[PDB]
Design a protein around this ligand. Structure first.
Ligand SMILES: C/C=C(/C)C(=O)O[C@H]1C(C)=C2[C@H]([C@@H]1OC(=O)CCCCCCC)[C@@](C)(OC(C)=O)C[C@H](OC(=O)CCCc1ccc(/N=N/c3ccccc3)cc1)[C@@]1(O)[C@H]2OC(=O)[C@@]1(C)O
Ligand code: NA
Length: 981
């Protein structure tokens, strides 16, 4: 029964056909169970390890390395036990990467699983099989059950309240709305069928807790049909798109397999002459192994094997750096999307403001005489909940007792108040107890002291509620008509210790319209036009002007209805009970913006980031707060840039989308508006950050690219967000966006660095196959360079100093390629250089070397025919074509070039003369370690046998530097072109 809130208690019992005193019969239970199912959210279908390792080996680059490992294993089988090192190392990389992925998924938290924590194990129902209550498992509760809840119990299903067995019934509906005060519940129907959950005063929602009381109710919905179950369906339907960099890895792997297959076809096309080669020969099995070994090396030379270790290391370090700035990022890929933020939608109370209220102004009526009117405006000092402060008028200290209107003003503030003040000696600060807006009144009456009580020598703990207690002794608060949004006010019925009176407080428009008289000191005058105009005039200046105050109208019913003539169970009659009032005065309190917020808004407009405020204030004050903190200008038109919840719904779907393109302020929004705003922003391809802190906010937090939770927010809101603000501050968002931009600038530098090395490595392997030369580089050597030799300077590039204008540039387009245009041409020339400089270093040892044979170019290209000891090949040991020294010339050239290419990667276009290499101290130290590790595999005896290397001399190294160092001069000329042409 979805509309149970709008149905009578008799209508709900008649729908299910269940007696309130007997309950559901054993037949009705098993028959309702087969129709509505069990009262539980669906279990989240987790994936197995087998499904997780299949997803790990689903990536195309992973499948290429796995195939290359399989080829290497069968090549090592058909050949020295160091041969199986190449298959084993390749497998260890994939296996280790899988373990990392398995650990990440296990550590990951699911918000749908978190919703279960709001499911009680047990419930209490009355059924026809027993007279007494039955404590059954909440899973077995069906719609139509008669349920009994009490203090401490968690509500097991969406329950329509039938009768309240206690005096009142207060519920903690905080799981839906962050952290909130207890709400009073009744049993009368709510006329609006499209009413929101705040207005369903006759409903108990599954997952909430009973703060006080005891009631009997009938179950309306269970399972996914509850309010907390409908939110689970919205989250289960939301799909998280891949981050732009995750998508770029897909296109890179898809294009890489197309190039590898093309290089293989090119190698075969160049060697088609072997089809005319004589059929009889023993080099055919050799030729297959030759092309199979090249295929293995071609894959290892193309895949950046060390990139996943460098990326996750950069993100893990940035997470620790953001946590120092109170930004808790929960997912590592979210750091990239963090820097791409285009729109920030932020709640006000708590984040944009300090949520610490204090009354700043107040006015009472001074004189009413026809068209002449006079007011007594006041000012209060002290922005904290502490009673320290004084009341001023015209910047002059005054005594509140000398004004009679202020005596009645303070009594309304002290009696029509459910909150209190407490002093904490551990923190040494007065603390609030209840609503922040109500506690501002308790602090105000302590500063006024209308009865001139003596509190100078009182203890600080006693000083907190001293003046409040004095007023409470005078009038006995009988009952309380709680706040409701239909009338936007509350009242209390009081008797002396003089007749009974009612003290009313609430929104100014509703209370003043229900006032027929006006208090003037101790006397009262009928409410007239000129007085009502000037009263509302000051409300507009305090709420819309530069004060940006929240105003409360305080009134009194001098002649309240008799106690017997009032029904304290129908919230519909509460407005009638609060009529024919007498205006007493208006207080104006401020929720101050945080110190750092006004500057963070300027950083956002300097960085092209739009800020959208989300409040619960009226449209007039919301626009005023925007002008105060910097979202709008002081004199800027905002007719089509600010909307309310009702204004936004009355628009067609096309106008709603166009509204979100320019709006910067949304006041009094419905729960579904956060998710709709995200969709409209995504329709313009924005990258949206949204704040929230309740289960209500969870669907929008998951929908947005960067859901933002509060450190004090609910657990479900955190598990549905990418980043959690430890201090709830809005400035933490902007600081994390700056860091995400700084991380990406360094990230794309060591991505271009490692990828350009893989280009030159593939050119090296291609030149070997296309010319028929011996293998100048071995997959075992290429793995060491990509994982260790180039991995250390790549990590050091992640510590590059960020640009000082990084927050002075618009947000980066998500589809911006990492390498394109002239940079695509540069890494082709660097790749064409590395490929030629590596195979040439080995050919130098095989020909023009003093310590190597003077093998001719024909013999080196036809080295697979030395086995015959052909007279065509001058007499020589054929094993020389398998010598370790020529591979050390090629490897030491690649290592030294990559150390040089790492310096060229410090800046995209700025010359090394302008930006010297000693800017990044970590990069110089990484090159020394990578070079120190190069001599480790050349001299410490176990390693040269494995890597097929033999140490070089002081002369052979000088030949490496002859070919390697001009890399710096080449890229410098390519940088000079981009800068000046
Ligand atoms: C890999 C090795 C080789 C040899 C190769 O064939 O490479 C080609 C190739 C696949 C390219 C092309 C390359 O073509 C050429 O060399 C043309 C032939 C030249 C030789 C001719 C001889 C006659 C490029 C190399 O050519 C040059 C010069 O740079 C540029 C560009 O690469 C990138 O931008 C790198 C993204 C890495 C990249 C990959 C992943 C990634 N992941 N983030 C994460 C973030 C967070 C978490 C996880 C992950 C981010 C980035 C591409 O064009 C690329 O394919 C594409 O689609 C582009 C747009 O990526
Ligand atoms: Na999200």
């Amino acid at each position: 029964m979805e509309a149970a809130h709008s149905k009578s208690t008799e209508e709900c019992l008649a729908y299910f056909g269940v007696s309130e005193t007997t309950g559901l019969t054993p037949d009705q239970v098993k028959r309702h169970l087969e129709k509505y199912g069990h009262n539980e959210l669906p279990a989240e279908e987790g994936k197995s390890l087998w499904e997780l390792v299949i997803e790990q080996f689903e990536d195309l680059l992973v499948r290429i390395l796995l195939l290359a490992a399989c080829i290497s294993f069968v090549l090592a089988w058909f050949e020295t036990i160091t041969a199986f090192v190449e298959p084993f190392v390749i497998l260890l990389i994939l296996i280790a990467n899988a373990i990392v992925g398995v650990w990440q998924e296990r550590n990951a938290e699911n918000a749908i699983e978190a919703l279960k924590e709001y499911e009680p194990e047990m419930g209490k129902v009355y059924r026809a099989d027993r007279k007494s209550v039955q404590r059954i498992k909440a899973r077995d509760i069906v719609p139509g059950d008669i349920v009994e809840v009490a203090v401490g119990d968690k509500v097991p299903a969406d329950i329509r309240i039938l009768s309240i067995k206690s005096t009142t019934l207060r519920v903690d509906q905080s799981i839906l709305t962050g952290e909130s005060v207890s709400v009073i519940k009744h049993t009368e129907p709510v006329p609006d069928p499209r009413a929101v959950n705040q207005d369903k005063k006759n409903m108990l929602f599954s997952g909430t807790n009973i703060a006080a009381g005891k009631a009997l109710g009938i179950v309306a919905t269970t399972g996914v049909s509850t309010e907390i179950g409908k939110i689970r369906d919205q989250m289960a339907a939301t799909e998280q798109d891949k981050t732009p960099l995750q998508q770029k890895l897909d296109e890179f792997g898809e294009q890489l397999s197309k190039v590898i297959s093309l290089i293989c076809v090119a190698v075969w096309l160049i060697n088609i002459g072997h089809f005319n080669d004589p059929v009889h020969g023993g080099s055919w099995i050799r030729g297959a192994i030759y092309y199979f070994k090249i295929a293995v090396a071609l894959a290892v030379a193309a895949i950046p094997e060390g990139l996943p270790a460098v990326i996750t290391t950069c993100l893990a370090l940035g997470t620790r750096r953001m946590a120092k700035k109170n930004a808790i990022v929960r997912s590592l890929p979210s750091v990239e999307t963090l820097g791409c933020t285009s729109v920030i939608c932020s709640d006000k109370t708590g984040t944009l403001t300090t949520n610490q209220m204090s009354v700043c102004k107040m006015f009472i009526i001074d004189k009413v005489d026809g068209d002449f009117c006079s007011l007594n405006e006041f000012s209060i000092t002290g922005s904290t909940y502490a009673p320290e402060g004084e009341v001023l008028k015209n910047d002059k200290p005054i005594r509140s007792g000398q004004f009679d209107g202020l005596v009645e003003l303070a009594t309304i503030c002290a009696l029509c108040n459910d909150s209190s003040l407490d002093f904490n000696e551990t923190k040494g600060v007065y603390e609030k107890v209840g609503e922040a807006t109500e506690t501002a009144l308790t602090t105000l009456v302590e500063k006024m002291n209308v009865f001139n009580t003596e509190v100078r020598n009182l203890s600080k703990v006693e000083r907190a509620n001293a003046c409040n207690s004095v007023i409470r002794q005078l009038m006995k608060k009988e009952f309380t008509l709680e706040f409701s949004r239909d009338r936007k006010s509350m009242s209390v019925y009081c008797s002396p210790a003089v007749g009974n009176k009612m003290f009313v407080k609430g929104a100014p428009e509703g209370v003043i319209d229900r006032c027929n008289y006006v208090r003037v000191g101790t006397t009262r005058v009928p409410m007239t036009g000129p007085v009502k105009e000037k009263i509302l005039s000051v409300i507009k200046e305090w709420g819309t002007g530069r004060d940006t105050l929240r105003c409360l109208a305080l009134a009194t019913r001098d002649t309240p209805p008799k106690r017997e003539e009032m029904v304290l169970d129908d919230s519909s009659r509460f407005m009638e009970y609060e009529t024919d009032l007498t205006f007493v005065g208006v207080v104006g309190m401020l929720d101050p913006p945080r110190k750092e917020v006004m500057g963070s808004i300027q950083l956002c407009r300097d960085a092209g980031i739009r800020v959208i405020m989300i409040t619960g204030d009226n449209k007039g004050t919301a626009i005023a707060i925007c002008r105060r903190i910097g979202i709008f200008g002081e004199n800027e038109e905002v007719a089509d840039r600010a909307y309310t919840g009702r204004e936004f719904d009355d628009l067609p779907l096309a106008e709603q989308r166009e509204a979100c393109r320019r709006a910067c302020c949304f006041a009094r929004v419905e729960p579904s508006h956060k998710s709709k705003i995200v969709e409209y922003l995504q329709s313009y391809d924005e990258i949206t950050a949204m704040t929230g802190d309740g289960v209500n906010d969870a669907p929008a937090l998951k929908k947005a690219e960067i859901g933002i939770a509060m450190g004090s927010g609910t657990a479900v809101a955190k598990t549905a967000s990418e980043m959690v603000l430890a201090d709830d501050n809005f400035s933490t968002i902007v600081a994390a966006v700056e860091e995400g931009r700084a991380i990406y600038n360094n990230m794309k530098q060591f991505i271009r660095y490692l990828i350009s090395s893989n280009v030159g490595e593939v050119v090296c392997i291609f030149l070997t196959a296309a010319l028929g030369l011996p293998e100048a580089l071995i997959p075992v050597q290429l793995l060491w360079v990509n994982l260790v030799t180039d991995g250390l300077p790549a990590t050091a590039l992640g510590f590059n100093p960020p640009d000082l204008d990084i927050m002075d540039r618009p947000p980066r387009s998500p589809k911006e390629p990492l390498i394109s245009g002239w940079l695509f041409f540069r890494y082709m020339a660097i790749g064409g250089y590395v490929g030629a400089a590596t195979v040439g270093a080995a050919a130098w040892w095989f020909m023009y070397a003093e310590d190597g044979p003077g093998v001719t170019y024909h013999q080196l290209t036809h080295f697979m025919q030395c086995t015959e000891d052909h007279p065509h090949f001058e007499g020589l040991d054929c094993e020389i074509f398998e010598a370790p020294e020529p591979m050390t010339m090629a490897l030491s050239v690649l290592v030294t070039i990559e150390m040089c290419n790492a310096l060229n990667s410090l800046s995209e276009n700025q010359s090394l003369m302008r930006m010297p290499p000693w800017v990044n101290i970590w990069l110089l130290g990484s090159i020394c370690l990578s070079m120190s590790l190069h001599f480790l595999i050349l001299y410490v005896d176990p390693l040269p046998m494995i890597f097929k290397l033999k140490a070089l001399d002081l002369t052979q190294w000088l030949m490496v530097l002859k070919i390697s160092l001009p890399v710096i001069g080449l890229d410098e000329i390519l940088k000079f072109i981009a800068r000046n042409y």
